[PDB]
Each structure stands twice: as structure tokens, then as C-alpha cells.
């Protein structure tokens, strides 16, 4: 059955993939309000679309900084992929455009803030709470992988909580459409699969490992592999050892042993039954996947809010006036954007 749902999804996706939307708005159509988060070559700002009054989250990338960091192709990937996908737990890309200086991607604003903030503040989630979120990541990866996409940057910092307390995955900077295998060393140290660190060549199995890290971090309050130095983190990841808090249920430990499996030939989500080995695990036995997909399950908590455009669930960041050069930068490099 789900076989059928994905089939139809892929046709919709493929059409947009081959004929992407381009230049669907202009900077002056948006009122810029406040920075919601930052990256090495840009920022995301809360904006208000003037003609409709809708609030959006507008990612602003400096073309010159994208080039210096060798992220041209990754950025083209991000935008091409994001304009073609459609899933309840994936943030929507509403418009994209560019000007002399920047690339712009206007996405839905998710007012609940990052899972990261909530997790650090409360310490750790209960198992039911973690499970509810993990289920949404399982369904989202199921969708994304059926499209030959790898996500490649799962972590709490990249998951937003919506007004219903459900997850919205954002940050498709490393997403890629690949059949077979890829080699780029990218991701976030705590979340890297052993095969990335080992320069092995890798595939969608790395997303399932990262799901292992995420669930662990959500339930424990810290990740399974951490140190002051990335190199010491890498050594722990490839050591093939992991320890669980004593409050982890036996089912949770069993699940995580199978996700944080250093051996591709043994990792859940990478065997014959694919994602169904995860969906059918006892830890998920209480999970009604259809109810989750349909947003019929009561969330562990709803973010607090006061009036639209309220940002209390996001940290404050240093603000920086936008400047658009009188000269076009890196035209050819971003032609297709």
C-alpha cells in the first residue's frame, strides 16, 4: 500500500525536479523583521509578505560566501530539491529568487522554534515523547529515500516544532539526489556515520544511523558520541562501542543497537525489509503510523505563543542590514537558481 502512495509522490516530485520553479518573487515584496538563525554563508529571517500578510522564514545566502565555501552545487541541490518535495513534516519552500548579491529561499515560518532549544532547556524527552518525534523522522526519511534523496544533516538544530507540536524538517543544505553512492564529507560531527568518517563511499544508510544518534540524544539529553574535539568524536564513532543511560528501556537499547550499527550489512533501514524493520520494532509497537502521518495523534506539548510573528521560541541574533551590490556577483555559478 504505502508502495502506492510513494509511487504517486514520485511522479509529482519528478515533474518539479525536471522543471523547477525559478524567480517567483522579489525582495521588496517582503518586510524583513528579525533573524531566526544563522549559518556560515547566510541567515534566516522572519519576514512578512506584503500582498498577503503571511509570515515566512526567508533564508538569505551571500553568493560570494557560498562560492568561497565550495557550496555552490550543494546550494543548487537544496533549492532544486526543496521546490519539488511535498510532505507533512517537511517545511515548504514558497518562493525563491536571487539578486546581484544574494540567493533567497522563502519557506514557511515554523513559530515553535528548534527542537534543540526545547531539548537543551528541559534536559531530555521521555521515551513516548522522543518516539512521537522519531516516528515523524522515520516517515520523512521513508518519503525522501523513495525519491533517491539523502538528507545528510539530521540533528535537533534542524528540526522545528509547529503550532501543533509536530516536527518540521528544514535545512536541506546537504540534501542530494543520488542513485548508488556518494563521497562528500559533510554533516555534523556528532551525527556522522562511520562510513562517512572512513571516506568509504556511502548511501542513504547514513540517514538511518543519524536517526539513531537523534533518538539517543532526545531520550538521554546528550548524544552517544561527544568530546571537546571533533577528532575525538570521530574516534568514538568508529570504535564500534556505545553506552546507554541506565534509564533507557531494553526495547530502546535494542533499537539503537540496530541503528548505530557500524556494519552497513546489519543496520536497520538498510536490510531487505528496509524501513519496515524500524517501523515494526517493538519500541514503535504503540506507534500508529497512519495517525501520525494524518496529524491525528496528540503531541507531547504545544509551543507557547502570543500573537502572530511572535519569536519568543527563537534565540536573538545580531542583526545585519542587507546590502545588494550594484554589480552582479557569480552570475554563471547560480544561473539555474
Amino acid at each position: 500500500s504505502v508502495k502506492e502512495f510513494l509511487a504517486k509522490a514520485k511522479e509529482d516530485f519528478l515533474k518539479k525536479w525536471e522543471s523547477p520553479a525559478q524567480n517567483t518573487a522579489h525582495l521588496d515584496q517582503f518586510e524583513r523583521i528579525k533573524t531566526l538563525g544563522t549559518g556560515s554563508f547566510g541567515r534566516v529571517m522572519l519576514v512578512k509578505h506584503k500582498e498577503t500578510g503571511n509570515h515566512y522564514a526567508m533564508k538569505i545566502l551571500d553568493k560570494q560566501k557560498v562560492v568561497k565555501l565550495k557550496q555552490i552545487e550543494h546550494t543548487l541541490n537544496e533549492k532544486r530539491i526543496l521546490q519539488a518535495v511535498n510532505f507533512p513534516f517537511l517545511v515548504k519552500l514558497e518562493f525563491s529568487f536571487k539578486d546581484n548579491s544574494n540567493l533567497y529561499m522563502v519557506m514557511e515560518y515554523v513559530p515553535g522554534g528548534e527542537m534543540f532549544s526545547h531539548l537543551r532547556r528541559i534536559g531530555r524527552f521521555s521515551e513516548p515523547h522522543a518516539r512521537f518525534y522519531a516516528a515523524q523522522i522515520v516517515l520523512t526519511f521513508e518519503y525522501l529515500h523513495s525519491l533517491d534523496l539523502i538528507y545528510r544533516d539530521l540533528k535537533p538544530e534542524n528540526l522545528l516544532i509547529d503550532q501543533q507540536g509536530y516536527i518540521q524538517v528544514t535545512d536541506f543544505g546537504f540534501a542530494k539526489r543520488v542513485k548508488g553512492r556518494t563521497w562528500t564529507l559533510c554533516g555534523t560531527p556528532e551525527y556522522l556515520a562511520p562510513e562517512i568518517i572512513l571516506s568509504k563511499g556511502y548511501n542513504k544508510a547514513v540517514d538511518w544511523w543519524a536517526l539513531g544518534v537523534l533518538i539517543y540524544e532526545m531520550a538521554a539529553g546528550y548524544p552517544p558520541f561527544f568530546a571537546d574535539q571533533p577528532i575525538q568524536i570521530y574516534e568514538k564513532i568508529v570504535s564500534g562501542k556505545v553506552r546507554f543511560p541506565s534509564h533507557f528501556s531494553s526495547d530502546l537499547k535494542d533499537l539503537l543497537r540496530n541503528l548505530l550499527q557500524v556494519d552497513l550489512t546489519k543496520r536497520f533501514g538498510n536490510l531487505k525489509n528496509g524501513v519496515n524493520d524500524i517501523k515494526n520494532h517493538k519500541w514503535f509497537a504503540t506507534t500508529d503510523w497512519i495517525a501520525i502521518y494524518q496529524r491525528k495523534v496528540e503531541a507531547p506539548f504545544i509551543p507557547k505563543f502570543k500573537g502572530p510573528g511572535d519569536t519568543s521560541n527563537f534565540d536573538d541574533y545580531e542583526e545585519e542590514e542587507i546590502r545588494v551590490s550594484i554589480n552582479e556577483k557569480c552570475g554563471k555559478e547560480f544561473s539555474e537558481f
Binding site: S40, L69, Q71, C186, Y222, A227
Partner: peptide
């Protein structure tokens, strides 16, 4: 405790991606 060691580590803030 493992939790105390995490909180006292340099990696409890937002984590940057690596690119290269």
C-alpha cells in the same frame, strides 16, 4: 555523571556542520 560531563563540554551549543 555523563550528563555533567556533557554540560561541561564545549559542545552543548549549536553545532556547526563540516563541509570538506
Amino acid at each position: 555523571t555523563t550528563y555533567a560531563d556533557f554540560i561541561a563540554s564545549g559542545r552543548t551549543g549549536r553545532r556547526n556542520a563540516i563541509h570538506d
